[PDB]
């Protein structure tokens, strides 16, 4: 129920893999989920429906 990819600094953007196939979401804007680093990982959760591109690392 996790899709991991990598975040886009500029767009603050996910781009991550699920079933086959790329999919681009914006990051949140809050401090401690957008994309801070560029090609950081992030992660959509379909379960939760969030995204998240200050994946634990
Ligand atoms: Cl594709
Ligand atoms: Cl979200």
Redesign the pocket.
């Known amino acids: 129920s996790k899709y991991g990819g990598e975040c886009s600094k500029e767009h603050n953007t996910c781009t991550y893999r699920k079933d086959?196939?790329?999919?681009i979401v914006k990051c949140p804007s809050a401090d401690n989920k957008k994309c801070e680093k560029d090609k950081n990982k992030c992660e959509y959760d379909d379960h939760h429906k969030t995204v998240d591109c200050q994946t634990p690392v």
């Open positions: 086959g196939k790329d999919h």
